[PDB]
């Protein structure tokens, strides 16, 4: 297949063999391919929200199969485990679960595939691509956190937490 | 400590032993073949100097030519390993087990052997 | 040593020591010819290893 | 177990309004484009100039000799020349990953 | 209706190689068709 | 034999290296897995019936250094060693399979004939360090 | 068959043994075989890929397909018709002949514990819906590509 | 005497350096044990802290366990990473419960 | 378009009222349309169906936005700073200057 | 070709390198290097390299390399007659010209088969 | 006719003092777009020469 | 001269190891800090013996 | 009836082919014999040369100076709008209908599509899911409570 995801776009195991003396093979599912992506054709338009959801699930599957490699090459494996990154991106998708336009979902899937390829090929910096993998309500697993707000504002409402903090600087 | 005749004969045969001793990687065997030819070159020079024979000194360039031809053929054969899906480490081109290799493990290209 | 780069380096050192012997045995012209030919061969071998 | 006119055993088909039945009809149409029978095998047909023993049927031309094995990867390549919506993990891809 | 004259796929090309020229000028000469070329 | 329980890595390592058992079975456990209780019971029941093995139980939670040293990946872990080097491992809880691998290791060690002076207990990391110096050290020197 | 006078012929479709195959490209095939033939003959008639079949069924006398196998048989002459049978029919087949096992273990490509030689397999009525896998077999001589 | 019951020859030698306890045969068709698969999958599930491992019912659906559409995909991908295997699309989409996942892994010979 | 035979300029206007802004791509007909349609899609959110290459052309990595829209402010939504605690460039909310 | 005096000069060159090393250390006194994330990483025009050890070449000129070996050998064989050409005779002249003709023939055959260019 | 080709400006004005839309067609964009088409099969030096010969300014291309 | 077309091009057939790229492609980037890249082009260049095989021109590094 | 119609159309086209073959002149028959005897000894290189010649590839070195103009510079023909407005674009797979239930586990899961269709018919409009960003203690304390 003449595609970046084609079965023949695999890095050879050796310099004279693909896999072994009796069989071929390679890994482009969990790591990057041998050849760069010249073109990324459009997702075939989905006439059904069913097909849009299937595209979303398959994109998430491709992302999850590729997150250990992304963590390893970007040196962010201590900020979150592979499963924590998967859960954070699942939360990101859950915040977008209300989509109902198959065309818009196809466009979002194309953008997500492009971003995944960018993070896969070191195009984007780790400090910038981690915002999708960053946890929502918990701190990063590579640095100490402060629970001063949790202790001082013990069981107080979110309104009071915002009220005591403020939304603008107090000097101007 | 050894006389030069003894040393050169001994180390020519030592090179021939080491060529067999080392793992059968084609590039390594090619390097050892060049070393063997150079040992023959030096031994021929030594015997020519000892016996005042210009014919033994003649084999100096002849050995160089034969070694160069064999090295070119070896380069071409090593290139040929790429197109035949053959590992340069020839021990990995067969399924026979050997304890000399830490990691040798070949399995059939199948997922499941038994379907329910 | 099984690393091909170190194997080739030790082959080069063996060539150097063979030339040193031939110099000690007063056969320096053959030392120079051996050195030039085998240095070219080792150069091409290094390129092959890079391949 | 009883059998149909072909050697396959008689079994009840999918429901009328099922995606399974729709996809089965679509797959039959796809097979018709490559001169492929119900079992995934290139059949005979009209001789083709310059293509050896490869024959041509009615709705399309075969991609192999008669009574041969239709390749799903070849069908995907010919139908979608360069378009992959997702990296589909087939048995071949899974086996390549396992071999690696 | 009469069958159309056969037109090869290698035709309709902006430029021709030697085999295309040989097929095209069959029965004639390069000087007979394109005229004489000078240096 | 009987199960010797250790909550410390250094104490367990000292006991195992001092005893120098010909056949040893180490059961590493942690509180995360709910199957460790049945693993505890299976280890206790198998300790009595096998006197050729020395049964040592290490709690990974109270001895976190043990997990790294013994290369434990998942709990419960049953590591069967002969003369200090790993013979086999069982990553799950199954009494029949654990007894089967105990029997297999026992039979194979019974069938061995070590040379005189080369039948001594070794530390667990000695074979790994030998392979590391023979392979990993040279690779690191070449690459980095 | 025990046909009687005036009885009509029987359908071929009712006498077909089905072999479900996993081709080397990991693809599902369904071929038809007849009792009394060899699996190699069925695979070659159905143009099944992956079977090199260098020796083409071995010798024509004292074959491995006979019941019982003659002691003076030479057995298989290569290791190119290797098919990995599924567990039920593999158990029903039984234990390997010594010559067949010798040829199976003397294979340049790795084998399995369910591996059998196709030309040593005789198609039987109980082999209906039999599942086999056919990974690519080795090429022995210079003429395997001729 | 030719002992036809002795099927051993130099091609059948199965002594490897990495295995102190030798393998039964040269073919590396050793499938993982059920308890090992269950413990590794239990660790993978322990990575997902909305699931209680104590009362885990292996025939129970992922939805009843507490896994959404994305959690099932994430869990299956994590299992693939743990066993270094790939699920073909049909198998991946057809997984209804951890019992089915365990059975599929057991039938697999490439799992490590 | 420019026609050399007729020495003419043509300007085709295509009206989009569907919310997803979906339209077919002529990237497979005119080779110019690859980067032109990539710019149009990344800047205006146009969904070009059947397009040869859908990757962004001028936008920053790991950013999804359509800046060339009247809803999108010129100053944007993010600013790139250097974070000492990360020892690398991060993206934060921007407090830009107003005249 | 030199002698032990050449070996001693090689030693003196090493000592000169030691002098340069001393100068470099003294220069090292005059600055401080601050540890940074990408300071000791590979440079690929401002972005992280996607490969560290697997940087493989295609080596399309192996025919040129093997011909270099053969023709260097041939030139070495040509050296002796040119060194002592003043004493040439009919035999030596014929042999030298025939050897040069063989070299030219080999080169021309290499040219005819287009093996002196790059390959895909 | 800019030195790099046909430099075009498409201005849609709504009547105000500000242009509603000012699209810019840069010749350098189309010149760089054909570089992969004409650069494939060339060595690195040839590719550098091709980058030089298209006379591309990246202010026009990126803008 | 004679024909050398087979030495000039190398196609890819499905599942063909010989026709595939039997080499790790040198996917170097003609990045910004390069004298010939004008400073604001990141040309992801897939090479095969310095032969420009694939182009992925990242532009917009000067998009303002 | 459809089988008979296809049989008749096949026979019509086969008769057309036979008319193409049987009505050849003696010189054409001799050329065909020569072509057959040449194909009996043509290598794969010769067949590739024939295919490239039919594709318009260069066949001399001077023409190989302009390889790209025929091999690469010719643009791909655009697809058809008939290909554009197709029913579905799932990758082709063998219809595992008569295959055993072991093989059907690898086929596309059509039950998933039915369940998704039911779900989206029952949920046409849903509220936006908001993941709360209020600070919470980590669910696993390992990064802050591990010693070794
Ligand atoms: C390696 C460490 C250096 C010493 C190695 C052993 C000695 C090698 C030289 C022997 C020698 O001097 O031979 C005499 C010859 C010279 O002959 P000579 O005329 O001086 O002979 C000595 C005089 N008699 C015998 C009367 C005592 O030395 C050489 O030709 C040396 C050439 C060296 C070329 C460069 C080598 C670089 C190595 C790095
Ligand atoms: C001719 C060679 C002269 C070498 C002199 C010593 C070099 C030196 O001080 O190196 C600096 C290093 C480090 O010196 P440093 O850490 O004091 O350098 C910092 C200098 N200031 C305070 C001006 C920023 O010294 C050494 O390594 C030890 C020197 C000998 C004791
Ligand atoms: P369940 O079984 O839970 O009902 O199934 C859920 C669905 C059906 C799959 C789905 O979630 C749903 O409810 N609706 C369909 C999907 C949908 O409506 N919207 C999903 C949007 S897809 C999306 O937005 C992806 C775009 C990516 C944005 C940027 C991230 C790209 C990668 C960045 C990080 C990579 C390297 C770090
Ligand atoms: S085909 Fe030769 S052993 Fe069966």
């Amino acid at each position: 297949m003449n595609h970046y995801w084609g079965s023949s776009n695999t890095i050879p195991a050796s310099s004279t063999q693909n896999n072994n003396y009796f069989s071929g093979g390679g890994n482009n599912v969990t790591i990057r391919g041998n050849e760069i992506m010249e073109r990324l054709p459009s997702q075939t338009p989905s006439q059904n929200m069913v097909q849009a959801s299937m595209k979303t699930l398959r994109f998430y599957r491709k992302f999850c199969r590729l997150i250990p490699f992304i963590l390893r090459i970007h040196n962010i494996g201590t900020k979150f485990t592979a499963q924590q990154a998967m859960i954070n991106f699942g939360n990101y998708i859950r915040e977008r679960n209300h989509y109902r336009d198959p065309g818009l979902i196809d466009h979002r899937i194309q953008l997500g595939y492009e971003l995944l390829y960018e993070a896969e090929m070191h195009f984007s910096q780790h400090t910038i691509l981690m915002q999708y993998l960053s946890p929502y309500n918990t701190p990063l697993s590579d640095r100490g956190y402060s629970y001063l707000e949790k202790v001082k504002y013990g069981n107080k409402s979110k309104f009071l937490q915002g009220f005591y903090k403020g939304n603008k600087p107090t000097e101007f | 400590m050894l006389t030069w005749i003894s040393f050169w004969s001994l180390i020519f045969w030592l090179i021939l032993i080491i060529l067999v001793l080392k793992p059968k990687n084609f590039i390594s065997i090619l390097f050892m073949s060049e070393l063997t030819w150079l040992a023959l070159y030096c031994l021929s020079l030594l015997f020519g100097a000892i016996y005042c024979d210009i014919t033994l000194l003649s084999i100096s360039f002849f050995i160089l030519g034969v070694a160069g031809l064999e090295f070119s053929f070896g380069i071409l054969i090593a290139i040929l390993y790429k197109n035949l899906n053959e590992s340069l480490n020839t021990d990995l081109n067969n399924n026979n087990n050997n304890q000399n290799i830490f990691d040798k493990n070949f399995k059939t290209p199948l997922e499941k052997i038994n379907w329910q | 040593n099984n690393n091909l780069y170190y194997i080739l380096l030790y082959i080069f050192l063996e060539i150097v020591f063979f030339g040193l012997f031939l110099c000690l045995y007063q056969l320096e012209l053959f030392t120079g010819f051996l050195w030039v030919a085998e240095f070219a061969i080792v150069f091409i071998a290094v390129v092959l290893l890079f391949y | 177990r009883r059998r149909s006119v072909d050697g396959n055993a008689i079994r009840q088909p999918h429901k009328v309004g099922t995606y399974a039945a729709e996809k089965q009809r679509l797959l039959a149409e796809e097979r018709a484009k490559f001169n492929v029978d119900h079992l995934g095998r290139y059949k005979g047909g009209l001789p083709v100039k310059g293509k050896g023993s490869i024959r041509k049927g009615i709705h399309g031309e075969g991609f192999g000799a008669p009574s041969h094995a239709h390749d799903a990867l070849i069908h995907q390549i010919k139908q979608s020349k360069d378009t992959m919506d997702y990296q589909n993990i087939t048995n071949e891809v899974a086996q390549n990953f396992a071999n690696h | 209706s009469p069958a159309p004259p056969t037109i090869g796929q290698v035709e309709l090309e902006p430029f021709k190689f030697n085999h295309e020229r040989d097929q095209l000028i069959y029965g004639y000469t390069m000087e007979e068709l394109y005229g004489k070329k000078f240096g | 034999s009987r199960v010797r329980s250790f909550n410390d890595f250094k104490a367990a390592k000292t006991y195992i290296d001092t005893l120098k058992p010909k056949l040893a079975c180490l059961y590493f456990r942690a509180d995360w897995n709910p199957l460790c209780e049945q693993a505890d019971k299976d280890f206790d029941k198998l300790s009595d019936t096998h006197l050729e093995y020395e049964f040592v139980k290490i709690d990974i939670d109270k001895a976190p250094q043990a997990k790294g040293y013994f290369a434990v990946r998942c709990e419960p872990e049953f590591l069967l060693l002969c003369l200090g080097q790993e013979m086999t491992r069982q990553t799950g809880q199954n009494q029949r399979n654990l007894e089967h691998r105990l029997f297999k290791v026992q039979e194979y060690v019974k069938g061995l004939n070590f040379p005189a002076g080369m039948d001594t207990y070794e530390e667990f990391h000695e074979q790994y360090m030998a392979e590391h110096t023979q392979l990993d050290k040279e690779i690191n020197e070449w690459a980095r | 068959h025990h046909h009687h006078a005036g009885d009509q012929a029987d359908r071929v479709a009712d006498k077909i043994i089905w072999i479900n195959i996993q081709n080397r490209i990991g693809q599902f095939e369904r071929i038809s075989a007849f009792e009394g033939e060899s699996l190699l003959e069925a695979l070659q008639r159905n143009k099944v890929a992956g079977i090199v079949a260098t020796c083409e069924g071995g010798e024509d006398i004292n074959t491995m397909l006979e019941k019982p196998i003659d002691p003076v048989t030479y057995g298989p002459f290569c290791s190119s018709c290797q098919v990995v049978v599924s567990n039920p029919w593999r158990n029903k087949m039984g234990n390997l002949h010594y010559l067949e096992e010798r040829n199976l273990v003397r294979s340049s490509y790795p084998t399995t514990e369910n591996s059998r030689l196709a030309c040593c397999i005789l198609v039987e009525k109980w082999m209906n819906e039999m599942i086999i896998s056919i990974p690519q077999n080795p090429n022995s001589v210079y003429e395997d590509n001729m | 005497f030719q002992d036809n019951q002795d099927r051993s020859r130099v091609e059948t030698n199965s002594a490897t350096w990495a295995h102190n306890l030798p393998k039964e045969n040269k073919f590396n068709t050793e499938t993982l044990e059920k308890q090992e698969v269950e413990s590794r999958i239990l660790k993978v599930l322990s990575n997902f802290e909305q699931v209680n491992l104590k009362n885990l019912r292996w025939e129970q659906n992922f939805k009843k366990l507490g896994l959404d559409s994305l959690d099932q995909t994430a869990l299956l991908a994590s299992i693939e990473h743990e066993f270094t295997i790939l699920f073909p699309d049909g198998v991946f989409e057809g997984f209804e419960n951890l019992e089915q996942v365990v059975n599929y892994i057991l039938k697999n010979i490439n799992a490590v | 378009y420019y026609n050399y035979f007729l020495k003419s300029k043509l300007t085709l206007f295509i009206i989009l009222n569907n919310l997803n802004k979906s339209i077919d791509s002529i990237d497979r007909i005119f080779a110019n349309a690859n980067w032109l349609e990539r710019e149009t899609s990344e800047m205006y959110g146009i969904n070009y169906k059947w397009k040869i290459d859908t990757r962004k052309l001028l936008l920053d990595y790991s950013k999804i936005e359509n800046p060339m829209l009247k809803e999108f402010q010129s100053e944007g939504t993010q600013d790139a700073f250097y974070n000492i605690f990360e020892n690398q460039v991060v993206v934060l909310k921007n407090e830009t200057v107003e005249l | 070709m030199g002698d032990a005096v050449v070996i001693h000069l090689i030693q003196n060159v090493l000592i000169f390198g030691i002098i340069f090393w001393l100068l470099t250390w003294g220069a090292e006194y005059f600055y401080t290097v601050k540890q940074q994330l990408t300071k000791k990483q590979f440079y690929e025009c401002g972005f992280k390299s996607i490969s560290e050890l697997n940087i493989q070449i295609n080596f399309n000129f192996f025919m040129l390399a093997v011909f270099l070996i053969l023709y260097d050998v041939e030139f070495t064989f040509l050296f002796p007659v040119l060194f002592n050409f003043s004493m040439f005779s009919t035999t030596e002249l014929f042999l030298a010209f025939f050897f040069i003709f063989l070299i030219l023939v080999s080169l021309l055959y290499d040219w005819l088969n287009n093996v002196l260019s790059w390959s895909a | 006719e800019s030195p790099k080709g046909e430099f075009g400006v498409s201005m849609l004005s709504d009547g105000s003092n500000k242009p509603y839309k000012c699209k810019v067609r840069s010749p350098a964009l189309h010149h760089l777009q054909v570089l992969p088409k004409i650069g494939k099969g060339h060595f690195l030096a040839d590719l550098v020469a091709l980058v030089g010969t298209v006379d591309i300014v990246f202010g026009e291309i990126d803008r | 001269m004679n024909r050398s077309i087979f030495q000039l091009w190398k196609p890819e057939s499905p599942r063909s190891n010989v026709n595939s790229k039997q080499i790790k492609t040198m996917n170097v980037n003609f990045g910004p800090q390069h004298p010939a890249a004008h400073g604001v082009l990141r040309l992801i260049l897939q090479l095969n013996g310095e032969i420009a095989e694939r182009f992925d021109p990242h532009i917009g590094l000067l998009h303002r | 009836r459809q089988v008979l119609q296809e049989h008749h159309q096949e026979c019509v086209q086969l008769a057309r082919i036979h008319a193409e073959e049987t009505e050849k002149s003696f010189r054409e028959v001799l050329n065909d014999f020569d072509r057959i005897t040449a194909e009996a000894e043509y290598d794969h290189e010769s067949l590739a040369l024939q295919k490239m010649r039919d594709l318009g590839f260069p066949m001399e070195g001077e023409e190989e100076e302009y390889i790209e103009q025929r091999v690469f510079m010719r643009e791909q023909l655009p697809p058809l709008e008939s290909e554009f407005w197709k029913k579905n674009y799932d990758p082709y797979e063998q219809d595992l209908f008569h295959f055993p239930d072991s093989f059907k586990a690898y086929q596309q899961q059509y039950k998933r599509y039915d369940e998704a269709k039911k779900y989206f018919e029952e949920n046409p409009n849903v509220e936006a899911t908001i993941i709360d960003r209020e600070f919470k203690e980590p669910t696993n304390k390992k990064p802050w409570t591990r010693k070794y």
Side-chain angles (χ1 to χ4, degrees), chain A residues 1 3 5 19 24-30 39 41 43-44 58 62 65 113, chain D residues 19 73 76-77 80-87 89 92-93 96-97 99-100:
Chain A
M1 190 69 176
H3 197 275
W5 295 328
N19 178 66
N27 185 23
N28 50 5
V29 186
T30 59
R39 58 172 62 181
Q43 302 285 317
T44 58
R58 292 161 185 176
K62 174 63 196 305
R65 285 167 170 163
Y113 270 136
Chain D
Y19 192 92
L73 178 63
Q76 183 181 3
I77 288 180
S80 57
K81 290 84 184 301
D82 56 327
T83 302
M84 294 188 65
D85 296 356
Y86 66 107
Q87 187 175 23
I89 302 303
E92 180 205 3
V93 181
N96 287 14
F97 181 86
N99 297 335
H100 184 77

Side-chain angles (χ1 to χ4, degrees), chain J:
Chain J
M1 193 61 186
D3 64 81
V5 76
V6 167
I7 303 180
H8 280 265
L9 182 46
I10 294 182
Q11 171 197 9
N12 303 136
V13 173
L14 299 183
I15 300 179
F16 193 65
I18 295 180
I19 296 179
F20 275 161
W21 175 23
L22 294 170
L23 285 177
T24 277
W25 186 39
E28 290 181 9
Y29 172 80
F30 287 97
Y31 59 85
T32 71
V33 176
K34 176 175 179 173
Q35 189 69 25
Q36 287 172 343
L37 176 60
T38 62
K39 165 172 287 299
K40 296 181 179 182
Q41 295 188 3
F42 294 156
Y43 161 80
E44 207 187 31
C45 300
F47 292 94
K48 285 201 58 180
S49 185
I50 62 177
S51 186
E52 185 180 61
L53 287 173
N54 199 339
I55 43 172
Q56 188 182 1
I57 63 171
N58 206 346
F59 196 12
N60 314 275
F61 48 97
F62 54 92
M63 296 309 296
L64 294 161
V66 304
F67 294 153
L68 167 68
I69 297 179
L70 297 182
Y71 300 152
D72 177 72
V73 161
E74 292 173 349
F75 303 154
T76 301
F77 266 106
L78 274 178
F79 261 134
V81 60
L82 307 179
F83 253 89
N84 288 315
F85 194 80
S86 61
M87 62 186 66
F88 82 100
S89 298
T90 288
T91 305
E92 292 84 330
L93 203 61
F94 173 84
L95 299 157
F97 279 124
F98 190 71
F99 197 71
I100 300 181
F101 175 77
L102 289 181
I103 300 178
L104 286 167
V105 160
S106 175
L107 280 162
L108 187 51
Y109 183 77
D110 297 337
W111 182 91
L112 288 177
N113 300 268
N114 315 326
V115 300
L116 300 176
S117 181
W118 268 240
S119 306

Side-chain angles (χ1 to χ4, degrees), chain G residues 36-55:
Chain G
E37 279 188 345
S38 74
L39 196 59
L40 182 71
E41 290 178 23
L43 294 173
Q44 288 186 334
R45 179 180 65 257
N46 293 272
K47 307 295 180 180
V48 178
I51 294 291
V52 178
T54 298
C55 89

Side-chain angles (χ1 to χ4, degrees), chain A residues 83-135:
Chain A
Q83 289 71 29
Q84 286 183 333
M86 297 177 188
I87 293 177
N88 295 333
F89 193 68
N91 286 13
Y92 179 88
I93 294 190
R94 287 179 189 97
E95 286 183 334
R96 278 72 174 176
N97 72 330
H98 58 265
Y99 290 3
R100 284 301 183 270
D101 196 334
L104 194 67
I105 292 183
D106 296 356
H107 196 193
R108 292 298 193 273
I109 289 307
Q110 296 175 191
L111 292 165
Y113 270 136
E114 177 187 8
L115 297 197
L116 182 64
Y117 178 77
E118 290 176 5
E120 180 180 15
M121 290 283 301
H122 266 292
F123 293 160
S124 54
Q125 193 64 28
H126 74 276
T127 48
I128 313 180
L129 68 97
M130 62 170 297
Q131 56 192 1
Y132 305 100
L133 319 179
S134 296

